[PDB]
Amino acid sequence: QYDISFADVEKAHINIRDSIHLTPVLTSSILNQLTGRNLFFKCELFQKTGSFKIRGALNAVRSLVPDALERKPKAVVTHSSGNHGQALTYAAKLEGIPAYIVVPQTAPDCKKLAIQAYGASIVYCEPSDESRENVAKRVTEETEGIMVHPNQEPAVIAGQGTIALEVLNQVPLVDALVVPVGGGGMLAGIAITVKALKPSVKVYAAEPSNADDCYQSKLKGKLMPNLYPPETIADGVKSSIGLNTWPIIRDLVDDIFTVTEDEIKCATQLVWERMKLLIEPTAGVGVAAVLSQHFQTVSPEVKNICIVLSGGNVDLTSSITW
Amino acid sequence: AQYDISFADVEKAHINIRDSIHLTPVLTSSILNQLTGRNLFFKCELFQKTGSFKIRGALNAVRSLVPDALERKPKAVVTHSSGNHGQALTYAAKLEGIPAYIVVPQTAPDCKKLAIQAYGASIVYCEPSDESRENVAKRVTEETEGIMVHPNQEPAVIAGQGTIALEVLNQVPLVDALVVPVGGGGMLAGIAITVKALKPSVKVYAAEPSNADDCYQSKLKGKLMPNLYPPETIADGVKSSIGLNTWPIIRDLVDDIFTVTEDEIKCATQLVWERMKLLIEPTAGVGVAAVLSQHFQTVSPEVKNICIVLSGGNVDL
Ligand SMILES: *Cc1c(COP(=O)(O)O)cnc(C)c1O
Ligand SMILES: *Cc1c(COP(=O)(O)O)cnc(C)c1O
Ligand SMILES: CC(=O)NCCc1ccccc1C
Ligand SMILES: [Ca+2]
Ligand SMILES: [Ca+2]
Ligand code: NA
Ligand code: NA
Ligand code: NA
Ligand code: NA
Ligand code: NA
Ligand code: NA
Structure with a gap:
């Protein structure tokens, strides 16, 4: 249903x-x-x-197929640069496959650095959704990956x-x-x-x-x-x-x-x-x-x-005072 | 071993x-x-x-120790502490339905006094010396038929x-x-x-x-x-x-x-x-x-x- x-x-x-x-x-x-x-x-x-997002992210990595002709994902891709992106990167690491986070050029520097330090690869896009989609779809196809939506x-x-x-x-x-x-x-x-x-x-x-x-x-x-x-x-x-x-x-x-x-x-x-x-x-x-x-x-x-x-x-440091 | x-x-x-x-x-x-x-x-x-953890020792003391009075049960607790010890003792006093008094130098800042009252201690004032602190605590403990409890x-x-x-x-x-x-x-x-x-x-x-x-x-x-x-x-x-x-x-x-x-x-x-x-x-x-x-x-x-x-x-x- x-x-x-x-x-x-x-x-x-x-x-x-x-x-x-x-x-x-x-x-x-x-x-x-x-x-x-x-x-x-x-x-x-x-x-x-x-x-909790490791639950959905790991299930996706362990259950989704990239293609009709390939049963095993060869990479994971997402536009999430928050808890989902972090969880997906961890899940990818567990499964021994690369993670790609599609990130607008306008994202804060601190976030760009954190994503990389955690072991994801960054792929830059324009702030535009048109560019975001172009970039992510391209990454997914080229790496034989799964795109994993956060929700x-x-x-x-x-x-x-x-x-x-x-x-x-x-x-x-x-x-x-x-x-x-x-x-x-x-x-x-x-x-x-x-x-x-x-x-x-x-x-x-x-x-x-x-x-x-x-x-x-x-x-x-x-x-x-x-x-x-x-x-x-x-x-x-x-x-x-x-x-x-x-x-x-x-x-x-x-x-x-x-x-x-x-x-x-x-x-x-x-x-x-x-x-x-x-x-x-x-x-x-x-x-x-x-x-x-x-x-x-x-x-x-x-x-x-x-x-x-x-x-x-x-x-x-940020949560010292809102 | 003993x-x-x-x-x-x-x-x-x-x-x-x-x-x-x-x-x-x-x-x-x-x-x-x-x-x-x-x-x-x-x-x-x-x-x-x-x-x-200090509620463990504090509650055990409040339920064990006896005042210098006719009645076997403490009728109050008295403390110098506004920290973990005093907060524990204050909660123990609440559980037993008795007041908790904290002896505080008259010169204490308003923010500290507000913090103390927030967890439910009753302030009794003393002079800012170790002599006055001790003597006020002794007086209050005796007059209220209370107990004091060393922190360690x-x-x-x-x-x-x-x-x-x-x-x-x-x-x-x-x-x-x-x-x-x-x-x-x-x-x-x-x-x-x-x-x-x-x-x-x-x-x-x-x-x-x-x-x-x-x-x-x-x-x-x-x-x-x-x-x-x-x-x-x-x-x-x-x-x-x-x-x-x-x-x-x-x-x-x-x-x-x-x-x-x-x-x-x-x-x-x-x-x-x-x-x-x-x-x-x-x-x-x-x-x-x-x-x-x-x-x-x-x-x-x-x-x-x-x-x-x-x-x-x-x-x-
Ligand atoms: C993602 C997230 C949520 C909400 O999950 P949705 O599936 O997007 O509704 C709530 N709390 C935290 C901490 C999250 O990371
Ligand atoms: C009191 C206290 C201690 C030390 O206990 P002692 O019995 O004084 O050695 C340790 N940690 C915390 C959080 C405390 O409040
Ligand atoms: C605040 C911050 O740096 N968030 C980034 C979280 C993230 C996203 C994707 C991969 C790895 C990490 C750490
Ligand atoms: Ca909403
Ligand atoms: Ca020491
Ligand atoms: Na649907
Ligand atoms: Na029920
Ligand atoms: Na179960
Ligand atoms: Na695909
Ligand atoms: Na004993
Ligand atoms: Na004190």
């Missing part, structure tokens, strides 16, 4: 489990007191590469869904999962998984109000991407949902909660100070959601809530 | 406190394993209630800290060594008593700043050699010297002491933030720095499974 099935999520977890961490679920008395709820924190900030690629979505297999196993009495949403690869993967296994468990999305396409899409009942590039401290959720994740989100996600920039900042600081976990602000989005006024509308029966702390890739 | 505590006291403390403290997780790190050549296990006391030499505190090792031995059955930051040595002594009672083949190693190397010097000389003057170190939590109660335990039951430079502490603390995403305070970086140090590299390869106590996460941000 959708672009992935629960079977694909299980194939993904078989494919990746030898190379990822079964990350712990931690608790906090303090956050329990603040929210009214029994919270559980799925600690993907401790995952290999610093975020719309079925193998990626399936890999991210493995988070939910772990959460359900780790928290048998869980009532809901709260998931930050950008392109919706993680949300969609989780939603497929939870609804296949235990549909009584709620799946809630958490999104910046400054980048509220998932909320607006669910509201309108059709895919409504951000018209303009969003401004938000939650740098990891600036992507809009897309054609492959939207149908899953429309049908299988129970509710969306939007949170202000101040709410994201305060929740992130709370996690830092009271939980001693170095989450990136993007991973504070789910925490802000459960703390938010609108979350009070969630039935009191929904008691045990697992929040995905999706990443810990923060630059400390 | 010391100010035995393992029996640690077992008592465990029963006294377990219902109110977190059994903190033990986490691992591939990169730190790769840097050290060992199998490392991180006992996450930074996730303990109040942000450090109090037997009830030493016994409480030992509970760290009780958990570690359960969580890491094949552990070969514990690495423990040492200041006053309440934590080191409690842990040493516990380990040597339960599984004496397991090594107990201390870690301290080379800028505050009284433990190392004391073990070398075979006698208590306190820091001659208050040390300067980023590891704010281990500025105290070992004392008369913890020294004999450390002398007899601690296998070795590793010293680490300020740069090593800072770098280890950064490595843990960046690579482990754990907001340890620099004092908790001391034990990590120890296991990364050149001296530790030479430790027998048989000592493979090493548990480092990440003692606290109370850092100013």
